[PDB]
Design a protein. Structure first.
Lengths: 48, 48
């Protein structure tokens, strides 16, 4: 009711929206280090 | 063995012929696998 609003809104993603209102998919990659040994690492190059 | 956040496992299967007790024969265990798990260990229990 008045002063008492549902907390979520839904986007109006029409195909003819201006670019500021187009959808964008996002990915955030967060890296971390703990005392556990490393397990994600960059590839290693080999010579002949 | 848990050392430096790695859980080592060494093992050996062996054919035997007795109803009880450990054999007398010498035989060396080989590295089975080695796991980078980081956890502390102080107790364990068998699954049956």
């Amino acid at each position: 009711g008045f002063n008492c609003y549902f907390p979520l809104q839904s986007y109006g993603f029409q195909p003819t929206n201006g670019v500021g209102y187009q959808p964008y998919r996002v990915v955030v990659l967060s890296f971390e280090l703990l005392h556990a040994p490393a397990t994600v690492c960059g590839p290693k190059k080999s010579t002949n | 063995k848990n050392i430096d956040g790695y859980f080592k496992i060494y093992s050996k299967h062996t054919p035997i012929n007795l109803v009880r007790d450990l054999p007398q024969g010498f035989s060396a265990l080989e590295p089975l696998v080695d796991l980078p798990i980081g956890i502390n260990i102080t107790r364990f229990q068998t699954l049956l």
